[PDB]
């Protein structure tokens, strides 16, 4: 379920965020909270309904 591969957006930090939409785990907390927009799932383009942060790097 959880995994910590490379954050697909930055590619520097691991992914530390499961996007509660579809269960895609792909972003990192800092990427999310830093960028303010309504963010879309980087993999599937669904709007994010909630973010379940994983406290990792
Ligand atoms: Zn990131
Ligand atoms: Zn998705």
Swiss-Prot record:
Summed up, the tissue specificity of this protein is: Widely expressed with highest levels in the heart, skeletal muscle, placenta, kidney and liver. Barely detectable in colon and thymus.
The stretches that face the Cytoplasmic side, renumbered to this chain, are: 2-57
Cross-link (Glycyl lysine isopeptide (Lys-Gly) (interchain with G-Cter in ubiquitin)) at which positions?
Answer: 4
**ZnF start-end (RING-type):** 7-45
Q: How is it modified after translation?
A: Ubiquitinated by PRKN during mitophagy, leading to its degradation and enhancement of mitophagy. Deubiquitinated by USP30.
Q: Where in the cell is it found?
A: Mitochondrion outer membrane; Peroxisome
Origin superkingdom = Eukaryota
Phenotype upon changing residue 10 to S? Failure to reduce TP53 levels and abolishes ligase activity
Q: What does this protein do?
A: Exhibits weak E3 ubiquitin-protein ligase activity. E3 ubiquitin ligases accept ubiquitin from an E2 ubiquitin-conjugating enzyme in the form of a thioester and then directly transfer the ubiquitin to targeted substrates. Can ubiquitinate AKT1 preferentially at 'Lys-284' involving 'Lys-48'-linked polyubiquitination and seems to be involved in regulation of Akt signaling by targeting phosphorylated Akt to proteasomal degradation.
Complexes and interactors:
Homooligomer. Interacts with MAP3K7/TAK1. Interacts with UBC9. Interacts with and sumoylates DNM1L. Interacts with MAVS. Interacts with TP53 (via N-terminus); the interaction leads to ubiquitination and proteasomal degradation of TP53.
Q: What is known of its domains?
A: The zinc finger domain is required for E3 ligase activity.
* Name of the protein in its database record: Mitochondrial ubiquitin ligase activator of NFKB 1
Protein species of origin: Homo sapiens (Human)
Q: Which residues of the full protein are shown?
A: 297 to 352 of 352
């Amino acid at each position: 379920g959880s995994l910590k591969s490379a954050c697909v957006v930055c590619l520097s930090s691991f992914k530390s965020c499961v996007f509660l939409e579809c269960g895609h785990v792909c972003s990192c907390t800092e990427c999310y909270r830093a960028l303010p927009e309504p963010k879309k799932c980087p993999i599937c383009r669904q709007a994010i309904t909630r973010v379940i942060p994983l406290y990792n790097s």
